[PDB]
Amino acid sequence: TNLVAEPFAKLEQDFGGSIGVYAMDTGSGATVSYRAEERFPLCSSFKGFLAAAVLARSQQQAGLLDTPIRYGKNALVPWSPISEKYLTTGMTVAELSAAAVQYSDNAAANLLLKELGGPAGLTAFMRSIGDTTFRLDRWELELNSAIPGDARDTSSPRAVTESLQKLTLGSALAAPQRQQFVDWLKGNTTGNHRIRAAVPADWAVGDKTGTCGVYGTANDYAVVWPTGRAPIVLAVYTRAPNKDDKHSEAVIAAAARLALEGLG
Fold first, then answer.
1. Cα–Cα distance between 114 and 209 in angstroms, integer?
2. 41 with 146: CB under 8 angstroms?
3. Contact 224, 204 (CB under 8 A)
4. Across-strand partners of 31?
């Protein structure tokens, strides 16, 4: 019997799909795990890890983050509001990274993927930090298909949380780069109704959302700084069996609340 899990099971059943949750209290090592090792599509949530990989590269390449990239219209993709805005002026690597993280900008994400050697290059970066679960296989927008049983472009809530911890709190990035990653996540604009909706208003939150949309597939991961407490790192992912099943932000927020409540 798993009593801790029961509210998560009820929540996913009402949702009509599966919810995956992993939360870590970095002070005590306490966790809350529900389907934590199952795979879920990354959707736009990969863009946080993409930005981290760019930051890692920027450690050894002087002025990389400050480098202007002058892309053309052929680089644009639907839902690239920042990239379109700066088409006539260009954007720095840092600005593209921030756009990918904070506005889920698709053109920015593809541009940065190209610099890293594509989906395989991002995957190699994740392997280099000890994440053997993460895989990115395709580019925007094809990576969002979220087909049940398809492992392409997936990770697990546990691996997402473990990697997020390494990159934001651990030693996977040098300190100045770690802090930049945190600053970008904290400035995310797309997550107000997800993990952020579950946390007390006074707590700092950095997050990245994903919304494949199809197959009820959406997610959010976050690092949370509780007033007067060690940070919490958590990941909440959803999916559902049928193509036109709707995702739910409310379900993500509700799962995040239960995770915070269940943590030592």
1. 22
2. yes
3. yes
4. 24
Structure letter (DSSP) for residue 224? E
Give the up-direction half-sphere exposure of residue 188: CA atoms within 13 A in the CB hemisphere. Answer: 30
- Active site residue: 33, 44, 45, 156, which one? 44
Structure tokens at 101: 């993280």
Cα end-to-end distance, the chain, whole Å: 20
44 is catalytic: yes
Residues 250, 264: Cα–Cα separation, whole Å:
24
Buried b (16+ CB within 10 A) or exposed e, 105-117: bbbbbbbbbebbe
Sequential DSSP letters for 80-110: -HHHHHTTTT-EEHHHHHHHHHHS--HHHHH
Is residue 12 part of the annotated active site? The answer reads: no
Q: Give every strand in the sheet of 204-211, ordered side by side.
A: 31-34, 18-25, 232-239, 218-225, 204-211
Determined by which method? X-ray
Rounded to the nearest angstrom, the gap between the alpha carbon of residue 136 and the centroid of all alpha carbons in its chain is 13
CA–CA gap between residue 181 and residue 47 (Å, rounded): 11
At how many Å resolution was this determined? 1.2
**Catalytic entry in 6, 37, 142, 261:** 142
Domains of the chain listed by start with CATH number: 1-264 (3.40.710.10)
